[PDB]
Structure formats: C-alpha cells, structure tokens
Design a protein around this ligand. Structure first.
Ligand code: IPT
Ligand code: MG
Ligand code: NA
Ligand code: NA
Ligand code: NA
Lengths: 211, 210
C-alpha cells in the first residue's frame, strides 16, 4: 500500500490503480513455504484486510492484489475469498504460483512473451496469445509486469502493443518499472553520483538490478 | 427390362452447387438385393467405454420388418479374426418407451468386451459384428454384418478427443474425380489415393462435399 496521498492524486488526476498487499516471500524455498502455512495466515491476513479497510473508498483503486512473488499457498485462496466477500466491486488478482491460479480473477503473468512459450515445470510462462485459449481458460490477461526496462531496454515493446490491440482478452499490462532505484552518493569534492547495489558496503547485493 | 429417365437438372440441383465439374448420369453401382419377407430392416452399432478404455459395451439395436413372432431371435456376435469374443441373443421387444409401450419390432443387444483393441488412424483395429436373424431353435433367416472399430469421439474442455487423447488432424479434402471416367469411382483409384495419403502423413479425409 502506498503513501495515502497517492490515491488522492490518482482519484483527481485520473489513473487506474492496482492496490497491493505488503506481502512478498520471494526468497523462501519453495516460494510458498510461508503462504501455504496456516501459522502465517494471521500475519498475511492483516496485510490484506487492513489495506482494504484503508483504501476501499478510493475510485482510482479498481483491482486488489494479494501481494507479489510468494508462490501460491492456501492462505492466498482464503484471503482471495475474503476480499471477494467483503468488496464485490473490484476484481482480485495475484501472480504467484503460475499467474492463473484459483486465487486470481485475471491471468496476470510477469514477463510472459508475446509469441514465445517458456514452459518452466510447474509454473510455465506461456505465450500470452497461447495462454488465453488454453483448454477451459476464459479469464482476461493483463501482465502484472512486462518489458523489463533495465538500462538500454524495451526491445520488442511494439510486439506487445500489436498483440494487445489484436486480441480482445489481451487487455495490456504494467511495465517494469517507472523509476530507477539509484541512490545519491558524493565524491571528495561533494559532487553527487548515482549509486546502486554494493555501493554502500552492502553484501551480498544484486548490483545494478535496482535500476 | 428396366428403363431409367435421368434428368441433368432438377430442383435438387439448387442444393448441388459444389465447386466441381457438373455432370450427370447413373454414375455409381446398380444392384439387385434379395431379402426375406421377415428381415433385418436396420441396425445401429454403438461402443461405450469406462474412463480408461479397459472395458467396453457394444450396444446393437436391430429393427425387423415382416410378421412379429414369439420364436424370432437376434444374435449379435463379435469376432476378432476367427475368435468369437462375445455374443448376445434376444427375442424381439424393446423396453418401454412411452405410455403406448415400446418397439415390438426392435431389440437391443449388449455385449461386454474386456480390454478392447481400440480403433484409430494409427492402428485401425477392427472387429466383425454379425447380426443373425433366426428362430429360437437356430434356423437362420438372414445375417447382416459390419466392421466394428472400438473408439470414442468426444469434445471435452474445448478439445476434440479420440479415445481420450487430443487429435491433430492432418487432413485433406478429396473430391471423387477420375480424368478418364469423371465422377465414377473404382476400388483401384480409391486404394491408390489412400496409400498416397497415408504415405504422405495424412490421417484424415473430408468427403467434400457429399
Ligand atoms: C529471476 C530473478 C531475476 S526475479 C525478477 O527480478 C526482477 C529484477 O528487476 C524483478 O524484481 C522481477 O519482479 C522478478 O521476477
Ligand atoms: Mg463452393
Ligand atoms: Na485487447
Ligand atoms: Na552479488
Ligand atoms: Na529490480
């Protein structure tokens, strides 16, 4: 959940918002180790329920999200149903555990390609065009993350937009991401420079991946 | 002496506008068929399966024409080569259908087949079904027959399945055409076409358009 003024500004300026619970357990092995554990349900539940109680009157919020990169656990299914029951006015999405689980109203993969399948075991990233027409599949597809804009990037961006415009159920996505997470440091003459992972003696680090 | 007056054009022509040579005449076989007065007038063969196709029921509905009689029977027997695999015998008289009863001139035979060899374009396993119309003590009136392929075709979850597996149709449309004979077909040309098709990795044909 963002600083509260953010929603006020999106209400007034006109932007659609996905409001997202403060839940990410990316580094767990496997990713759902905590989110499939009932002992962690109370902690996760408050991160979802208190968000909804805070932001539910904001028109800019159109979609609720269960968080990010935390696999798919039974706790997600439970909290999915909680929101659906409390606020029928907004779809609920969640990408974890393969982007099309029972905990999401929208197929919301990250970095699924336009034409190329990436058939990882258990959590495949299908071509977005292919994904829509999988047997039994009926949901809209909106990428929660796509076109990773790291350095000299956005190669192939037009390929996404061509597909989005041709396919009714391909309803777009959210570029990753808006602003470089670089930090200012100063040289001996007080001149500022942009710093990334590792530049503060922080180790282990992931270097320029923050930009 | 038979006399046949064949008309090139009719009201039927309005439903025969296929993209092909427009021809006319007696272009398929002519034959004479002798049936007894008491006869098999129709038969339908169905094959249903359990979830893993390890069990099947062959269901054969048989219709008769002529005088209905208590001593009349149908035997449907199923053969794999020279081995009889299953057989059912029943008098005529179907189950109740509605308030006026059922079909006295019909009977349905149900045969159990364990581990049926399944028919597909990959392995065209066939059985032979013989339909015998006979008296109770076994005088044959007549027999009809057909080749039986045990297979299930269904659409499930948006997929066309044969024997539970999604097909990939390697198909071709085929008109009935001979450069010398027009729209007359012979066994040799038919066999030639089928060998060439299978040899070129085709598994399906559409009878375009008739
Ligand atoms: C396979 C890993 C790099 S995960 C990858 O890292 C990215 C780095 O910018 C983003 O954080 C994405 O959300 C994440 O899926
Ligand atoms: Mg035509
Ligand atoms: Na679209
Ligand atoms: Na490192
Ligand atoms: Na990053």
């Amino acid at each position: 959940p963002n600083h509260p003024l953010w929603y006020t500004l999106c209400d007034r300026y006109g932007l659609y918002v996905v409001d997202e619970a403060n839940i990410e357990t990316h580094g767990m092995v496997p990713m759902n180790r905590l989110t499939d554990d009932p002992r962690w349900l109370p902690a996760m539940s408050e991160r979802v329920t208190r968000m909804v109680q805070r932001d539910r009157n904001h028109p800019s919020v159109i979609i609720w999200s269960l968080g990010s990169e935390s696999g798919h656990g039974a706790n997600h299914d439970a909290l999915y149903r909680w929101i659906k029951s409390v606020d029928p006015s907004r779809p609920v999405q969640y990408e974890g555990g393969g982007a099309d689980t029972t905990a999401t109203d929208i197929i919301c993969p990250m970095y699924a390609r336009v034409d190329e399948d990436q058939p990882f075991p258990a959590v495949p990233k299908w071509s977005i065009k292919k994904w829509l027409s999988l047997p039994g599949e009926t949901r809209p597809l909106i990428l929660c993350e796509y076109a990773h804009a790291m350095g000299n990037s956005l190669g192939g961006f037009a390929k996404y937009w061509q597909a989005f415009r041709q396919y009714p159920r391909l309803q777009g996505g959210f570029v990753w991401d808006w602003v470089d997470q670089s930090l200012i440091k100063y040289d001996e003459n007080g001149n500022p420079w942009s710093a990334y992972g590792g530049d503060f003696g922080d180790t282990p680090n992931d270097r320029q991946f923050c930009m | 002496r038979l006399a046949v007056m064949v008309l090139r054009w009719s009201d039927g022509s309005y439903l025969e506008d296929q993209d092909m040579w427009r021809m006319s005449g007696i272009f398929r076989d002519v034959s004479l068929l002798h049936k007894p007065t008491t006869q098999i007038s129709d038969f339908h063969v169905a094959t249903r399966f359990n979830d893993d196709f390890s069990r099947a029921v062959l269901e054969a509905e048989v219709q008769m024409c002529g005088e209905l009689r208590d001593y009349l029977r149908v035997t449907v027997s199923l053969w794999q080569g020279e081995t009889q695999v299953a057989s059912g015998t029943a008098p005529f008289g179907g189950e109740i259908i509605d308030e006026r009863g059922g079909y006295a001139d019909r009977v349905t035979l149900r045969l159990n087949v364990e581990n049926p060899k399944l028919w597909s374009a990959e392995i065209p396993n066939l059985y032979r079904a013989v339909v015998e119309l006979h008296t109770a003590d076994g005088t044959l009136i007549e027999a009809e027959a057909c080749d039986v392929g045990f297979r299930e075709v269904r659409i499930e979850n948006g997929l066309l399945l044969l024997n539970g597996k999604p097909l990939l149709i390697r198909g071709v449309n085929r008109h009935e055409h001979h450069p010398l004979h027009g729209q007359v077909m012979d066994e040799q040309t038919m066999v030639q076409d089928i060998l060439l098709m299978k040899q070129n990795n085709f598994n399906a044909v559409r009878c375009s358009h008739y």
